[PDB]
Amino acid sequence: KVFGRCELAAAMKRHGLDNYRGYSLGNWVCAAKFESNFNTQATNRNTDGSTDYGILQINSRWWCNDGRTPGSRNLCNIPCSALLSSDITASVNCAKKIVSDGNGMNAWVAWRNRCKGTDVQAWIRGCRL
């Protein structure tokens, strides 16, 4: 499913992401925009053989099991396919564990390079939340 900007903001807010660990909603929406372009089905393979899955591009080397990443740790205890669902619950639950890992949202390279230090508030502007 390809989410609309405000639709995603609302779903994320409903799932408890607004201000989770100090990161306002705009940060999460901005990250999803640049990580997957709001597409729940997005996948991208990396040079190390691991693959990124879903709306938040969660990596198979540490967070989910895809059956093809030797040494995967599966810290979120879910098959990576669960992260491609139109229902973002699994992605959100796993993202909460990732952002609590110590490096915060820097875990997401697109957030660090394209959202961090920008007016992220613009990402939820105009939305009925």
The two three-digit tokens of residue 93, written as one number = 């639950």
Resolution for this experimental structure (Å): 1.8
Residues, the chain: 129
Which is catalytic among the residues 52, 66, 87, 119?
52
| Residue 127: count of CB within 10 angstroms of its CB | 16
Task: Mark whether 52 is an active-site residue.
Answer: yes
DSSP state of 78: S
Q: Which of 45, 63, 72, 54 is nearest to 100 (CA)?
A: 63
Which is catalytic among the residues 35, 48, 87, 119?
35
How far apart are the C-alpha atoms of 99 and 101, rounded to whole Å? Answer: 5
Q: Which residue has the tokens 């990580």?
A: 35
Q: ∠ CA(65), CA(68), CA(74), 5° rounding?
A: 20
Residue ranges of alpha helices (H) inside 1-129 are 5-14, 25-36, 89-99, 109-114
How far apart are the C-alpha atoms of 127 and 114, rounded to whole Å? Answer: 21
Q: Which of 86, 101, 97, 78 is nearest to 11 (CA)?
A: 86
How far apart are the C-alpha atoms of 37 and 78, rounded to whole Å? Answer: 23
Q: Which of 73, 61, 121 is nearest to 52 (CA)?
A: 61
User: Is residue 76 classed exposed, middle or buried when 0-12, 13-18 and 19+ CB atoms within 10 A define those classes?
Assistant: buried
Q: Quick one: fold of 1-129?
A: Lysozyme (1.10.530)
* Experimental determination technique: X-ray
Segments making up each domain of the chain, as ranges = 1-129
18 is in an annotated binding site: no
Task: Mark whether 7 is an active-site residue.
Answer: no
Beta carbons of 98 and 63 less than 8 angstroms apart: yes
Q: Which of 16, 83, 23 is nearest to 56 (CA)?
A: 83
